[PDB]
Amino acid sequence: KLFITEGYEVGRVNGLAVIGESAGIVLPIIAEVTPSMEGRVIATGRLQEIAREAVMNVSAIIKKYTGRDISNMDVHIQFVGTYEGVEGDSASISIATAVISAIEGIPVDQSVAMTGSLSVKGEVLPVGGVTQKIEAAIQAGLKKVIIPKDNIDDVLLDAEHEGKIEVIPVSRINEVLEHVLEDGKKKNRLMSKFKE
Amino acid sequence: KLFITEGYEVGRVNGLAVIGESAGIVLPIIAEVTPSMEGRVIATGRLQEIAREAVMNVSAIIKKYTGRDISNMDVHIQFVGTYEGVEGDSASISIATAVISAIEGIPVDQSVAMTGSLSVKGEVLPVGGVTQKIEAAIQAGLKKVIIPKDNIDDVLLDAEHEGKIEVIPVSRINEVLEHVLEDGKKKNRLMSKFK
Amino acid sequence: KLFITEGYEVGRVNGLAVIGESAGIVLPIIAEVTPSMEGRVIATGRLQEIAREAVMNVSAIIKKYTGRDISNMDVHIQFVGTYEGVEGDSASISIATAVISAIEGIPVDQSVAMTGSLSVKGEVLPVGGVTQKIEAAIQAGLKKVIIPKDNIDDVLLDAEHEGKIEVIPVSRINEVLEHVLEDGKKKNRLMSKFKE
Amino acid sequence: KLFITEGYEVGRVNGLAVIGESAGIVLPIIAEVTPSMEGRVIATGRLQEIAREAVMNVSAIIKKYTGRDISNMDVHIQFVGTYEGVEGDSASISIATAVISAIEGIPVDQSVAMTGSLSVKGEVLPVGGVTQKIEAAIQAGLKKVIIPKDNIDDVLLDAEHEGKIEVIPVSRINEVLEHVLEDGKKKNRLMSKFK
Amino acid sequence: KLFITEGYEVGRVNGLAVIGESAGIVLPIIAEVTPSMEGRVIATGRLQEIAREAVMNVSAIIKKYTGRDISNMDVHIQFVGTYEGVEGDSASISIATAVISAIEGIPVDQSVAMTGSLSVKGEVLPVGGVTQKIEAAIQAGLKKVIIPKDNIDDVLLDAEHEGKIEVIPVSRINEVLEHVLEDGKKKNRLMSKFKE
Amino acid sequence: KLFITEGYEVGRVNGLAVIGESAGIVLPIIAEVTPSMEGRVIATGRLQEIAREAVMNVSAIIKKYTGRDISNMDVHIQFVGTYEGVEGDSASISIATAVISAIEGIPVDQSVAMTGSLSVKGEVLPVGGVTQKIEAAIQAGLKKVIIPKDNIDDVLLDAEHEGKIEVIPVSRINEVLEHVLEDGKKKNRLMSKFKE
């Protein structure tokens, strides 16, 4: 199977996505980081362009909140499996989440999938095919799905479904991290860094 | 909805644009600026050269009048949502407006969209697709498109678009801010710096 | 309107080009220059390569006859308007002409459109589409049209349209300039500077 | 015939991949190394992003355990054959493996296909298209196939096929190496280095 | 009209090409060199890659046979006019002629048009649509047409059409230059570094 | 036609490609070398990275064997031909062979073609499309086709192709070589260099 459904893992997130117009999918990302040999973002396959765009875009948010500049480190991003036929999210919050995880060595809840794009301001703004994703998620045996707050009323769950996934609307990057990073002294420090 | 339409709000604005044909869409920008360890405009997409340009024109206006150097501070320009076959506007005023809005950190009326092209020396130059653009601001339920002046007569709106919206003829950048940049002490300050 | 058709403005020049396969359009153009403190030609959209070829060529000529070394300047060039399926003359001379005008800061006559491919050496080479361009010129109500002298047998106008525009042709850029540049001290002192 | 099914060769591994939207193919590779007197990774084709990626995850892994650095080496990789319609897997292990084989000088077992994505930490990640990666390797007469353990449930074989190949599930790049590298003094001391 | 049919001009050659595959056309070019003040080939719009290629090949023999390194110069090629539906020769001897011409300032004779491709060892190789081309040469009042020696029997002319143009087959670059460069002291010294 | 087929010229190697689907193209290569006046591999088009690969590999095996180093040469590598959908073998041996030719200044049997991938041990790896290649090599009325050895059995031929040609299998560069160099003193000196 292409993704983990529970446990905690560094630089590892289950985003969600769309195949064709039919349907949604579990889209899992690893991020890993190593210092550069000036610094680039490595990824390949049908999604590399989504990946440099999120990673690059989010990169100031990522400097306000470790203090590691991205151009001092190499960011190794893959998508786990292959997917031709898939639209992914712009500035996707999973790809930023997995990177912050990897930079910070703080693990991620696999049982919580996510969707949204990430304002360079740090907000999370709406994305297509939410119902179709939750749906893929309900199909995956994942437990909670984070989503943007303005897709709140695009969640057209057809009952019996209303109780098999916990749908969590967020609107900051800090809410996404709060809700998926493993508890501990590290995330506690981390969270406290989210302000002005 | 997806794109915001009520409120005021920082380094983010309503670009008008056109997917080629008769074909309007509302294209927001979102800007953000961070004083740097010079600096680099960071933006992605088919419309980076434009993000870059808008920004480059807009530092003359700001080192000159304000006397802020925008070379000291990395700048994020990002357009929103999935846009395909879009023609952008050279030195597009949505961006430069958002850029003044990041940097003097002062919100913008989101009733208001706009389109235009910013000359280094401050002008709002005319642009193609001025009508279909207004038609876009309309089925997106907005209050006021701002629009270049030399574009008035490229409005030729029909009965189902006539009186639906406030069109603002602008010649200068500061006519743009006069009209969208929210109110109080900072705007007032930014204004006088100019003349 | 996307162009001006009377008076003088700095750094502004109504080009001529062809849309699809019949017709002309006026290709209006602005250039502006600030010191760089070397520098670039910033232009965007579809016709950018032409802007850089023309500024690349104007500037050598600038350096030979005046003093001003475009080396030291950012030239910012725009096609007021947005031009798809439109196709220029290489080393377009509207463009070179708008640059020579931002730099000298002598305004240009808007009542006269033009078209020419500019050699590094200073000639105005011939260009495709004269007849049609001159028709578009007639159409926006522009008084004259400056063309490459070798394009003179290409002019195919119905006798009544020969009443409508002046057709001037030319073999060197400095002739485009007496022909366009605002009458003046500056302009004179400038014509002096291309004594050959 | 485009790959080998018997014997050991230095720096040659039988990858596995898909052509169109089913059918596996065996995807064989040489890597080779020479020093760089910096270092570059040399591969053409539709699959070379992958080749560059594979190698760049191997380096750090090798450095961390073996001490050898690859900045001071040029690496030359080839997909023996011509590979259109084909997607490889991210950072294929088969390439990672063929690089380790090169540098260390230890023959690889040609009768064992392998598929997988190597992570920078040395972990073996799951992949698209396992079954036809398996069918195709049977098709070629390979005796074992190494697959990412996390894909054990994707293995879908008819019994007449269950007996025809050995499915070996791994989760780490050192396991792959033990399972493929030729036996001997080199192999062992090499392993003592990943523990 | 777009080419000069007689006299000599620095860096100015009448190549031949084909419009679609109905007909030949004169495709006239100009190369011009300025110093680099790392060096480059500037050129525009439609046959810009034929242009970059031709030069990138001949560089070779620009050094090997004679004088200057073109990585220290900028090569500014233009096609005089505009070029859609036209098909460009590779490693074009008309470019190389133009570029050798501009560097030596030895004028090229405009009553002789040319087609063919330059190998890097400097044989001229067959090209396509030669009859059509010559038919363009003929049509356009150029006196003489240089063509590749392996196309000799691909020339299929009507009676009337054969005396209408001198046809000159060549097998090597130095013959093309023997043929089109202004006699005089400078060509003599150029031509005599085209040994062994 | 545009290519060689009996004969013995230097720097030139009739290789083999597929135009995409499976349609035999002879793809002639011209190599050329001069000294840097460090050095460079000077190629044009889609194949231009193959070239530098074929080159790269060949310098390695030359430095080793002959002792000669050719980091000093400026290498020119040319594709004779005009087709798109062009599809080349990695480290393609044609190029490897035109080059070794170039350098050792040694004429090639024009009457022979080849496909092949060359490794840094100067093995001949097999390549796909073996049968289409043997065909354009027939259509091109050539006498011999060198193929990689392990390609030995992707060889078919309906009645119409069988015994139309000396197909010749190889596993090493020095075979490729023994096959195609013009006999005598410099073949010889350079040959045994691969043995010493």
UniProtKB/Swiss-Prot annotation, chains B, D:
Signal peptide: none
Active site per database record: S90, K133
Lon proteolytic domain location: 7-183
Cell location: Cell membrane
Family under the similarity heading: Belongs to the peptidase S16 family. Archaeal LonB subfamily.
Record's function text: ATP-dependent serine protease that mediates the selective degradation of mutant and abnormal proteins as well as certain short-lived regulatory proteins. Degrades polypeptides processively.
Subunit-level organization: Homohexamer. Organized in a ring with a central cavity.
Protein name (database record): Archaeal Lon protease
Organism expressing this protein natively: Archaeoglobus fulgidus (strain ATCC 49558 / DSM 4304 / JCM 9628 / NBRC 100126 / VC-16)
The organism's taxonomic lineage, starting at the top: Archaea, Methanobacteriati, Methanobacteriota, Archaeoglobi, Archaeoglobales
Shown residues within the full chain: 417 to 614 of 621
